[PDB]
C-alpha cells in the first residue's frame, strides 16, 4: 500500500506479489512514477556514488581484516610456508573439534585461510606492515565517506546536473580516457617507481621519506633532457631476492619481458614501464573529442561519415541511438567489461604479476574461476541489455537502414547459422567424446579419435615455444620477427623466450589432444549461449508466434496457451536459458583449467593428457578422484580444516536441487496448494486470531523462473567454489 | 572462540548484534514499513 512507492500499480494489489515485485522493480528507474529523463539520470548518478562507496567499504573491510585478524606480519617472512589468514572465525556453534581443526596457519583463534590473494597483492605493491594496511583501511573509509557525500550532494537541487551534462559524450570520453584511464595509470606507475620497486629492492619509502628519497640516483633532469637510458641502466639481476637488497639494480623502468626468477612473477620495473606506456597512450587518446575549445572530433561526424554500399545508411543516426539509450550504453559497457574480465582471468594465471602467487595454487585457482564467472555474468548481462534496448529504447524510424536496422532485417539468417554451428560443433564434440568413451570402455584405447590441436600449437610456436618442432616466427631465431632486422629492438625477447620455454610456469601451457576437444566444447558453449542471447535480443521485438512483444515488455510471463502454447517467449526467458548455458560453459572451462593445472602443479601431466579424451576419464580422475579429500572433511572419526568446504559442497547441492523445484514445478500446483493452506489457517482455532494483511499467493511465473535461476546459480557457484578450493588446498597446502 | 588479536571482546558483542539485532531490527522496521498505510 505504501512500500512500492515508486509504482502506484503495485501499491494496490492486496497480495504478497507487491512485496516481491517491489523488491524487483526498485532499481528499474525507467518504470517509476513521475520519472522524467533528467530525474532518471540524476538518480542513476547518485546510485553510482553509493555503489562506489560500497566498493570502497568492501576493500576497506578486506584491508581491515587482513590488518586486524590476519597474519600479514608473519606471512611476509616466508610467504611460501605460511598460509595467509583472511579473518577470524567467531561463531558460538563450534565444538571443540572444529575449534582445534580451524586453528591453522599459526594462530590461536580459529581462522579462515585467505584464497582471494590480497596478501600477495599487498606484498607486491609495497605494503609490509599492519600499520600500512590500517592506514589504507582508514583512508578508504574516508574515501567512501567522500563518495557518499558526493552522491548526497548531487541529489541537492543546486548541484543536480542538467540533462545536457549527462548527454555530453565527448567530454566524458576525454576525461575518462585521459583523466581516469591515463592519469590513474600514470599515478600507479608513480607508486610503482616510488614505493613498490624500492621496497621490493629493500628500502622503506613511506610517506615520510617519500620526498627525501628519489627513486633513482639520477634525478628528473635525465627525464627532461631526453637521455632516458639511465632509467634502464642496470636491471634487476636474475639472483634478486624480493623485499631485500641483493643485486637490486636501481633501474626504475626496464623491459626484460620475462619472469622474476624468485617470485615467479613479472618484474615490478616491467610493470611500471608498462603503466607508463599505457598512461602515455591513454592520455593522448583523451585529446580526441571536441569540447569547449576548437580542436578534436565530433562523434556524430565520425559515425555519420561511415556509409558504404554494402550497408547503405551505414552508421547514420547512431550517435543519438547510443546517447539517448541507457540500455545500449549499459550493454556496451557490460560487453567490454566481460571481455576484459575474461582477459584478466586468462592473463593473471599465465602472466602472474604478484609475488609468490604462482606458487600459491589455491588462490590462483580461485582468482581464475572468480573472474571467469564474473566475465560470463557480465557478457550475459550485456546481451540482456541488448534485448532490453531492442524492447524499450529502439526506434526503427531514426534507425532506418543503418547497421541496427540491418541486424533486425536478417536476424533469421544469423540465428539459423548460429543454430547450425552450435548443432554441428555439439554433435561432433559429443560424438568424439562418446566414441572415445565407448572404445576405451571396450578395452581398446588405441581406437580413440585423438586430434592434434595443431593450430594452437602453431600459435604457441609463433610466440616462441619451440617444443613442437615448428620454426616459424619466434621459434626460428633467423626469422624476420625474432631478429627484428631494422632495429633489433627485441629487448623483451631473451627473457620472454627463457620464460615461455621453461616447463614450470603456466605461461603457454603444453596443449595436446585432450585440449582440442575441450576447446571445441568451450566453443560450443560460447556459441549456444550466444545463440540464446541473440535469439532473445533480436526476437525481443517479436517473432511470428507473437508479432507484438514490445508492448508486453521485457519480462512478461507468457502469452497464454493459445497459438500452440507460448510458455517462455519473452526475451527475459532467453536470458534465463542462456544463464543456464553460461553456467554450463563456465563449468566446462573451469573444470578444464582446474584439471589441467592439477596435472601441471603436481607434475603428473600424463593423467590429464591420457585421461581427458573420454568422459569417464573426466568423471573418475577428476570428479571422483579429487573429491576424496573433500567429502572426508568431516567423517565420524573427526574434523579437519576442509570441513566448512564439505559443508558448503552439500549446501550447494541442496540449493541446486531447490532450484530444480522452482524450475520444474509451476505456479498452478502451488497456487491451489496455498489455497488449501489458507483454508487451514482461516478455519482453525487459536490461529484465526492472526490474519494476513497481504493475501498469500504463489510466486509469479517469471518471478519463480528468476528464483529457480538464482538457486541454480548460487548452489552451482557454492558447490564449485567448495570443490575447487578444497581440492587444491587438499593437496597443495 | 578465544581471541588472540586486539579487542577480542568486539566480535563477542558484534556477532550477536549483526546476527540478531541487525536482522530483528531490520526485519521489524521493514515489516512495519512494507505494511504501513
Amino acid at each position: 500500500t505504501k512500500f512500492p512507492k515508486f509504482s502506484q500499480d503495485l501499491a494496490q494489489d492486496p497480495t504478497t506479489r507487491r512485496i516481491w515485485y517491489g523488491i524487483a522493480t526498485a532499481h528499474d528507474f525507467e518504470t517509476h512514477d513521475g520519472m522524467t529523463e533528467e530525474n532518471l539520470y540524476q538518480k542513476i548518478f547518485a546510485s553510482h556514488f553509493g555503489h562506489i562507496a560500497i566498493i570502497f567499504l568492501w576493500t576497506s573491510g578486506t584491508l581491515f581484516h587482513v590488518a586486524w585478524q590476519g597474519n600479514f606480519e608473519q606471512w611476509i617472512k616466508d610467504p611460501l610456508n605460511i598460509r595467509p589468514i583472511a579473518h577470524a572465525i567467531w561463531d558460538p556453534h563450534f565444538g571443540e573439534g572444529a575449534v582445534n581443526a580451524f586453528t591453522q596457519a599459526g594462530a590461536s583463534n580459529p581462522v579462515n585461510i585467505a584464497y582471494s590473494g590480497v596478501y600477495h597483492w599487498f606484498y607486491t605493491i609495497g605494503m609490509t606492515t599492519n600499520q600500512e594496511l590500517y592506514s589504507g583501511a582508514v583512508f578508504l573509509l574516508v574515501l567512501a565517506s567522500l563518495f557518499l557525500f558526493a552522491g548526497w550532494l548531487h541529489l541537492q537541487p543546486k548541484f543536480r546536473p542538467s540533462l545536457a551534462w549527462f548527454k555530453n559524450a565527448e567530454s566524458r570520453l576525454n576525461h575518462h580516457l585521459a583523466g581516469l584511464f591515463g592519469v590513474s595509470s600514470l599515478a600507479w606507475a608513480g607508486h610503482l617507481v616510488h614505493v613498490a620497486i624500492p621496497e621490493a629492492r629493500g628500502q622503506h619509502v613511506g610517506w615520510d621519506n617519500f620526498l627525501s628519497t628519489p627513486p633513482h640516483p639520477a634525478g628528473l633532469m635525465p627525464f627532461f633532457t631526453g637521455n632516458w637510458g639511465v632509467y634502464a641502466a642496470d636491471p634487476d639481476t636474475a639472483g634478486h631476492i624480493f623485499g631485500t637488497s641483493e643485486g637490486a639494480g636501481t633501474a626504475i623502468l626496464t623491459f626484460l619481458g620475462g619472469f622474476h626468477p624468485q617470485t615467479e612473477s613479472l618484474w615490478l620495473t616491467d610493470i611500471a614501464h608498462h603503466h607508463l606506456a599505457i598512461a602515455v597512450i591513454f592520455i593522448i587518446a583523451g585529446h580526441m573529442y571536441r569540447t569547449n575549445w576548437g580542436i578534436g572530433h565530433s562523434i556524430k561526424e565520425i559515425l555519420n561519415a561511415h556509409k558504404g554500399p554494402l550497408t547503405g545508411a551505414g552508421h547514420t543516426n547512431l550517435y543519438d541511438t547510443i546517447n539517448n539509450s541507457l540500455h545500449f550504453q549499459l550493454g556496451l559497457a557490460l560487453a567490454s567489461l566481460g571481455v576484459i574480465t575474461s582477459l584478466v582471468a586468462q592473463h593473471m594465471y599465465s602472466l602472474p604479476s604478484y609475488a609468490f602467487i604462482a606458487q600459491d595454487h589455491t588462490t590462483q585457482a580461485a582468482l581464475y574461476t572468480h573472474h571467469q564467472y564474473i566475465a560470463g555474468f557480465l557478457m550475459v548481462g550485456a546481451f540482456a541489455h541488448g534485448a532490453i534496448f531492442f524492447v524499450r529504447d529502439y526506434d526503427p524510424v531514426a534507425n532506418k537502414d543503418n547497421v541496427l536496422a540491418r541486424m533486425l532485417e536478417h536476424k533469421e539468417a544469423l540465428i539459423s547459422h548460429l543454430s547450425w554451428v552450435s548443432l554441428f560443433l555439439g554433435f561432433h564434440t559429443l560424438g568424439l567424446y562418446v566414441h572415445n568413451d565407448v572404445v576405451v570402455a571396450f578395452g581398446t584405447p588405441e581406437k580413440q579419435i585423438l586430434i592434434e590441436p595443431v593450430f594452437a600449437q602453431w600459435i604457441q610456436a609463433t610466440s616462441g615455444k619451440a617444443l613442437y618442432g615448428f620454426d616459424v616466427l619466434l621459434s626460428n631465431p633467423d626469422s624476420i620477427a625474432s631478429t627484428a632486422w631494422p632495429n633489433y629492438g627485441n629487448v623483451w625477447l631473451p627473457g620472454w623466450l627463457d620464460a615461455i620455454n621453461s616447463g614450470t610456469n603456466s605461461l603457454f601451457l603444453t596443449i595436446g589432444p585432450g585440449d582440442f576437444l575441450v576447446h571445441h566444447a568451450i566453443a560450443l558453449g560460447l556459441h549456444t549461449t550466444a545463440l540464446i542471447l541473440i535469439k532473445g535480443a533480436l526476437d525481443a521485438r517479436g517473432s511470428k508466434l507473437m508479432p507484438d512483444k514490445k508492448d508486453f515488455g521485457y519480462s512478461f510471463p507468457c502469452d497464454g496457451p493459445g497459438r500452440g502454447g507460448t510458455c517462455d517467449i519473452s526475451a527475459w526467458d532467453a536470458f534465463y536459458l542462456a544463464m543456464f548455458w553460461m553456467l554450463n560453459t563456465l563449468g566446462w572451462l573451469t573444470f578444464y583449467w582446474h584439471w589441467k593445472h592439477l596435472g601441471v602443479w603436481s607434475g603428473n601431466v600424463a593423467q590429464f593428457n591420457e585421461n581427458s579424451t573420454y568422459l569417464m576419464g573426466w568423471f573418475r580422475d577428476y570428479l571422483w578422484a579429487n573429491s576424496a579429500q573433500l567429502i572426508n572433511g568431516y567423517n565420524p572419526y573427526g574434523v579437519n580444516n576442509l570441513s566448512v568446504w564439505a559443508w558448503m559442497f552439500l549446501f550447494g547441492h541442496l540449493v541446486w536441487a531447490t532450484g530444480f523445484m522452482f524450475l520444474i514445478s509451476w505456479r498452478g500446483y502451488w497456487q491451489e496448494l496455498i489455497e488449501t493452506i489458507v483454508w487451514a489457517h482461516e478455519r482453525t482455532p487459536l490461529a484465526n486470531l492472526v490474519r494476513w494483511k497481504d493475501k498469500p499467493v504463489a510466486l509469479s511465473i517469471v518471478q519463480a523462473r528468476l528464483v529457480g535461476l538464482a538457486h541454480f546459480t548460487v548452489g552451482y557457484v557454492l558447490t564449485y567454489a567448495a570443490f575447487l578450493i578444497a581440492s587444491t588446498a587438499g593437496k597443495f597446502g | 572462540m578465544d581471541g588472540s588479536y586486539a579487542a577480542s571482546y568486539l566480535p563477542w558483542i558484534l556477532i550477536p548484534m549483526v546476527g540478531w539485532l541487525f536482522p530483528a531490527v531490520t526485519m521489524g522496521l521493514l515489516f512495519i514499513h512494507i505494511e504501513s498505510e
Partner: peptide, 30 residues
C-alpha cells in the same frame, strides 16, 4: 600486531560513512 585502540578508532571513523550513507540513501528515497 595491531593496537586495541586502533580498532575502536577505525570504528568511530567508520561511523562517518554510516551517517553519510544513511543520509545519501534517505535522499535517494526522495
Amino acid at each position: 600486531a595491531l593496537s586495541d585502540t586502533q580498532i575502536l578508532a577505525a570504528l568511530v571513523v567508520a561511523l562517518l560513512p554510516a551517517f553519510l550513507a544513511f543520509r545519501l540513501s534517505t535522499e535517494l528515497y526522495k
